[PDB]
Amino acid sequence: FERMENKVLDMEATSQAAGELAGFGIENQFAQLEASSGVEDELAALKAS
Amino acid sequence: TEQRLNQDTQEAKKWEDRAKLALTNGEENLAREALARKKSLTDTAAAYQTQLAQQ
């Protein structure tokens, strides 16, 4: 069980590995802020129609 | 060389727009990063202007 717990920490480490790799995108992320606000603005106009 | 000058000068305008976006989003650290890209493009544009003057 103790050696298997160390193997469970490989899954935890793999989850953080994907999070650190996703962190490379933070400079580009500003495009997602403008895209998301834009779709809510036209969706609000569509809901108001 | 005049085409490269237009490519690097329009790339500098693109980075200036990314800097403006970073400042409205409050990410001043990304604004400085964009300004660093802009500076190397304007400094090489002056080198291409000098090359074009010789040509």
UniProtKB/Swiss-Prot annotation, chain A:
Disruption phenotype: Essential, it cannot be completely disrupted. Cells with very low levels of protein have no ordered thylakoids, are barely green and are non-photosynthetic. It is found in: Cell inner membrane. It comes from the Bacteria. Required for thylakoid formation. Belongs to the PspA/Vipp/IM30 family. This is Membrane-associated protein Vipp1. It comes from Synechocystis sp. (strain ATCC 27184 / PCC 6803 / Kazusa). The chain holds residues 168 to 216 of 267 of the full protein.
From Swiss-Prot, chain B:
It comes from the Bacteria. Disruption phenotype: Essential, it cannot be completely disrupted. Cells with very low levels of protein have no ordered thylakoids, are barely green and are non-photosynthetic. It is found in: Cell inner membrane. Required for thylakoid formation. Belongs to the PspA/Vipp/IM30 family. This is Membrane-associated protein Vipp1. The lineage of its organism: Bacteria, Bacillati, Cyanobacteriota, Cyanophyceae, Synechococcales. The chain holds residues 57 to 111 of 267 of the full protein.
